[PDB]
Design an enzyme around this catalytic site. Structure first.
Site, PDB file in Angstrom:
ATOM      1  N   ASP A  13       0.825  -1.198   0.000  1.00  0.00           N
ATOM      2  CA  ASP A  13       0.000   0.000   0.000  1.00  0.00           C
ATOM      3  C   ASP A  13       0.866   1.256   0.000  1.00  0.00           C
ATOM      4  OD1 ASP A  13      -2.397   1.285  -0.047  1.00  0.00           O
ATOM      5  OD2 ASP A  13      -3.130   0.475   1.863  1.00  0.00           O
ATOM      6  N   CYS A  61      -7.834  -2.946  -4.867  1.00  0.00           N
ATOM      7  CA  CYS A  61      -6.837  -3.122  -3.827  1.00  0.00           C
ATOM      8  C   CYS A  61      -7.643  -3.085  -2.531  1.00  0.00           C
ATOM      9  CB  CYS A  61      -5.724  -2.070  -3.909  1.00  0.00           C
ATOM     10  SG  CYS A  61      -6.283  -0.381  -4.230  1.00  0.00           S
ATOM     11  N   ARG A 110      -3.108   1.733  -5.696  1.00  0.00           N
ATOM     12  CA  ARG A 110      -2.570   0.706  -6.582  1.00  0.00           C
ATOM     13  C   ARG A 110      -3.502   0.464  -7.765  1.00  0.00           C
ATOM     14  NH1 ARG A 110      -1.391  -3.294  -1.594  1.00  0.00           N
ATOM     15  NH2 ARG A 110      -3.218  -2.085  -0.857  1.00  0.00           N
ATOM     16  N   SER A 111      -4.820   0.454  -7.524  1.00  0.00           N
ATOM     17  CA  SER A 111      -5.763   0.254  -8.623  1.00  0.00           C
ATOM     18  C   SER A 111      -5.661   1.351  -9.671  1.00  0.00           C
ATOM     19  CB  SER A 111      -7.196   0.170  -8.090  1.00  0.00           C
ATOM     20  OG  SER A 111      -7.340  -0.919  -7.192  1.00  0.00           O
ATOM     21  N   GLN A 156      -2.360   7.541  -5.309  1.00  0.00           N
ATOM     22  CA  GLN A 156      -2.426   8.113  -3.973  1.00  0.00           C
ATOM     23  C   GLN A 156      -1.130   8.760  -3.500  1.00  0.00           C
ATOM     24  OE1 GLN A 156      -4.941   8.182  -0.980  1.00  0.00           O
ATOM     25  NE2 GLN A 156      -5.607   9.002  -2.981  1.00  0.00           N
TER      26      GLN A 156
HETATM   27  O1  VO4 Z   1      -5.483  -0.030  -0.955  1.00  0.00           O
HETATM   28  V1  VO4 Z   1      -5.233   1.054  -2.395  1.00  0.00           V
HETATM   29  O2  VO4 Z   1      -4.637   2.173  -1.117  1.00  0.00           O
HETATM   30  O3  VO4 Z   1      -3.591   1.028  -3.124  1.00  0.00           O
HETATM   31  O4  VO4 Z   1      -6.417   2.331  -2.858  1.00  0.00           O
END
Ligand code: VO4
Ligand SMILES: [Mg+2]
Length: 299
Positions: free
Chosen positions: A181, A215, A221-222, A262
């Site tokens: 993450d 994710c 990540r998505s 993110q």
């Molecule tokens: O769990 V993800 O933070 O990469 O949206």
């Protein structure tokens, strides 16, 4: 080409944080009124990650049609993705109902169930062939058919059955194991090797429903995965790498779901992955075997 000149200018000026904050400032803001209804509180994993009303996926049940999932419809690229949170213990049936209704063939999971001491996603698929899952609420059955476990990712064959109609479908599960993450993947090569495995399976074909990507929150990540794929597809249809404006593409994706990508390092990584992937798009077929070897997927 132009993305690569921009990459080195941002790198040499050390301004990835500023470039990324610019994207956050310019991003779309649309209402999420359904996601915030009191009856949907327990369907959201994170209070600050919600689907926009205009792009949310609606379940086909008259009771409550809400799932935390968004249709990212990239009109110019002619590809769609469903980005969703990691399902909760009470939304696993909803998740598979969405897969069924949207006619998806592939699910891309970029997280582990347990990360950093905490449960980031429910165990929504069966781990053993002989222990199938029945989702009573949505009348679906899910069976593990086989799995191919590589060094850093796993591909599973699942059988999803609609128990009302007895129709069955093969669902492919692409599960990335070592992408933490709020970080970028370990290398462009391992990321691209995984992305092209998803591509080669046929899961992204316009003949199927949109691939489901998740994710834990369905944005970081998505978003990185879908940004790289869309940029490579745009370059592919034009056969022109310099025509792709990756920040514009990201802002377009953010019209459909908040918060995609993110961290500044995930944005920087997206440039790296697209620049490397361009070598394959523009006809150096051999580079795909180089990624596979650098991925050490058999170790
Ligand atoms: O769990 V993800 O933070 O990469 O949206
Ligand atoms: Mg650029």
């Amino acid at each position: 080409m132009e993305m690569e000149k921009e990459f080195e200018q941002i790198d040499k000026s050390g301004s990835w944080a500023a470039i990324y904050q610019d994207i956050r400032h310019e991003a779309s803001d649309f209402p999420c009124r359904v996601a915030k209804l009191p009856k949907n509180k327990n369907r959201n994993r994170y209070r600050d990650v919600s689907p926009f009303d205009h792009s949310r996926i609606k379940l086909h049940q008259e009771d409550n049609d809400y799932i935390n999932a968004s249709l990212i419809k990239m009109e110019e690229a002619q590809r769609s993705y469903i980005l969703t949170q990691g399902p909760l213990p009470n939304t696993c049936g909803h998740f598979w109902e969405m897969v069924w209704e949207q006619k998806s063939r592939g699910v891309v999971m970029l997280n582990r169930v347990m990360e950093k001491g905490s449960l980031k996603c429910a165990q929504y698929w069966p781990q053993k062939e002989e222990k199938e899952m029945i989702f009573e609420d949505t009348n679906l059955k899910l069976t593990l058919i086989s799995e191919d476990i590589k060094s850093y990712y796993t591909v599973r064959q699942l059988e999803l059955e609609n128990l009302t109609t007895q129709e069955t479908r093969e669902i492919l599960h692409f599960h990335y194991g070592n992408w933490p993450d709020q970080t970028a993947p370990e290398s462009p090569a391992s990321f691209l090797n995984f992305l092209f495995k998803v591509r080669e399976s046929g899961s992204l074909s316009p003949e199927h429903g949109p691939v489901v990507v998740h994710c834990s929150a369905g944005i970081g990540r998505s978003g990185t995965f879908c940004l790289a794929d869309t940029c490579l597809l745009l370059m592919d249809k034009r056969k022109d790498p310099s025509s792709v404006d990756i920040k514009k593409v990201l802002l377009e994706m953010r019209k459909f779901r908040m918060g995609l990508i993110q961290t500044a390092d995930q944005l920087r990584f997206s440039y790296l992955a697209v620049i490397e992937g361009a070598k394959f798009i523009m006809g150096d077929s051999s580079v795909q075997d180089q990624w596979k070897e650098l991925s050490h997927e058999d170790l």
